[model samples]
Target: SKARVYADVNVLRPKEYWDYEALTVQWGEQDDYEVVRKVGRGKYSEVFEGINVNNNEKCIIKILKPVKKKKIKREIKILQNLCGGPNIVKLLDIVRDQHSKTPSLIFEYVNNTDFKVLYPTLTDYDIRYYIYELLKALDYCHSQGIMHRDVKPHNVMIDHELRKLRLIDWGLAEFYHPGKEYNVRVASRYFKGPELLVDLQDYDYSLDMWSLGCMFAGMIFRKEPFFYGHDNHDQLVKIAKVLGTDGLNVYLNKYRIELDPQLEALVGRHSRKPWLKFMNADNQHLVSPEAIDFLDKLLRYDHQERLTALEAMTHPYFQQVRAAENS
Candidate 1:
C-alpha cells in the first residue's frame, strides 16, 4: 500500500507577518519521514503522502494553519473530543508552534475514495447499505451530543472492501444546546439545516439529518443539488425551487420563523409533492424498482417528513442486501 495525501491549501499562504518558507520547511522535515507525493491542496492545508523510514508504512500528513488564534483554538478543541472514535478520523500527532497560532496534524492515511465518487457505480442495494453505515456513524455522534453540522459528500471517506465509512473534518461540529447561539458560524450553506437559515440560536442533532437528506437525494437521484447556489441566498433559492414552498413554509412556521414576501414568493404556497423521481425519473442513473421506493423516502424535502438516518438504514431496500446473504 502507498500513501497518497492532500492537505488544506490555506496553510501555505500565511500572512506576511509569518515566515512561510520556514513553516513549510518545518513541515517537510518534521519527525522521521519522506514525502512521496503531493496528492492535493485544500483551502486550509496541503496534504502529502509520506513514508516512515524504518517501518515503510504509508501515512498522510495534514497540516492546518489558521489565520487567527481563535480559529486555531476552536479546531484543536474539537479535535481533542474527536480523538476517541474509530469512525472519526484519528488525529495522530501535532506539530506545535509558539510564534504562530496554527499547527499540523498527522493522521493514518486511508486507501480509498469518497462516497460521492462511489455512488454512481453502486448496485441499488449497495447504495442503501452505504447509507446504513453512514447512519451508524451519525447515531454514534449524536449519542455523544455532537452534531456533525457539515455532513456532505466531501466528508465521507470510504473503504469499500470492508464496507467501512469514516466521517472526517470536525471543525464545524459542536456539542451545543438547541437554543444557545455558539458565536462561531456554521459550515457550507448548501448543507445547512432549516434552523440555520432562520438563524435559530438553539438547534439540535437534526441539522445533520437535513444534510443527510440533501446528500441522500443527491446520491440516489443524482438530481441537481438541492442548493447549488453561488452564495447563501442563492442556495436558499435552490432549496425553495426543490421544496417549492408548502413543505418549506410548514417547516418555517413550525419553527416560528417569519418568511418575507420575496422568499415566500420564491418557495411558493405549496411544497413539491412526494417525489418518486429519484430512481431514473431525472435521467440520472439506471436505478432498480426496489431503489425507486427507497429513494423516495430519502429525497423527501421536509426533514420532519423525510426518512431519519436510523430509519433509512433499516428500510426494506437495505433489507434486500441482507436477504441476499441467506440466498
Candidate 2:
C-alpha cells in the first residue's frame, strides 16, 4: 500500500537521486584506515573498530563479503542520498583492496553499548528519548522516499551516556515508488512485518514502523525479540499467537492477500493477547499505559494502520521527551 505521507518524493526528485546504476564510484584509499579490532559480524559483512591514520580519529570499518556490484552501489547510493539527516549513520568514505577490490565502507564511530546491556541500564525517560531520536531518522528517510528494510535493534547504534542514537546498515534500504511491488525479503526474521510475511509486495514506509514496533516491544517488555519465530513461516505464527489470527484474517481480506495453504493452516484460529499480560515484575516500570497505547498503534496487522514515524514522535508516550526538548 501507499504511504500516508511523502508518497511522491521519488517522483519529485530528478532520476539521478535514486538511480544507483548510472552513478560512478570514486573509491577512497584503503591505506587511510587501519582495522584495530573486530567489533561485530553479520551474514554479509564484518565490522571492525578502526583508526583513520590520516587524521588519527577512530572509525567503523564494515568490510562487506562478496556481493553484487549493483548491490554495493545501491547501498553507497542510498547512504549518499541520506547523508547527514538527523540520526542517520554518516558514511565517511569508501575503500577497497588494491588487487582484488574487496570493499569496505568507513563510517564515523558511534560509542555504542551493547543493546542487551544498554536497554537494562536505561531509565524509562531515556527509552522515550532514544526512540524519539530514532524516529527522527526514520521520518527523515521516509520523507526522502527511502525505506530502511532492516530496522532491527542491532542496526541502531546507541551511545548511552553520550545520549545519541544512529540508525545504520543501509544495505537493504531502497527508495520507495508508490504502487511498485518491492521485494518482501528484506528485514531480519524477527522484525519482519506481516506485509513481508504475507508476501504483500506493495508495502511502504509503514514497514519500518512495524520493525520499530518490534524493537519497542522488545525494549519495554524486556524480551530480546518480542517475536521469536523458529522459521520464516513460524515468524508469522509467533505474531499470530500475540496479535491473534482474527486480525490477520481481516488484514488479509482487506488487502485481498491469500496466505499459502500451509501458512494459513499453521496460523489457525487464536485470540489476541492483552498488552498488560506481558507486564511482569521485571518490566512494570517500563510498561506504562502510554507505552502500551503507543505500541498498539505501531504493531497493527495492516501496514496502513501503523503510525507514520512523524506521527509516532507526537504520541503521548513521548510527551515528556518533547517537553524536555522544548524546555
Residue 100, candidate 2: C-alpha displacement in angstroms: 2.6
lDDT of 1 by residue, 1-327 (tens): 000111112234334212222222223235555668876477666677877666777877666644445444455555555566647777665564556544566666766664556766666556677667778777666654566788888787778777777787776776543345653257676777655665554555656777877776676667536568776555666666656666666667776778667766654554564455434555345455556666556544444455655666677667765566564
Q: Which pairs clash in the backbone of model 2? A: 1-202
CA lDDT of every candidate: 0.61, 0.92
RMSD of 1: 9.7
Tens-digit per-residue lDDT, 159-216, candidate 2: 8878889999899999899899999899999999999998999999999999999999
Per-prediction backbone clash count: 15, 1
Error of 2 at 274 (Å): 1.3
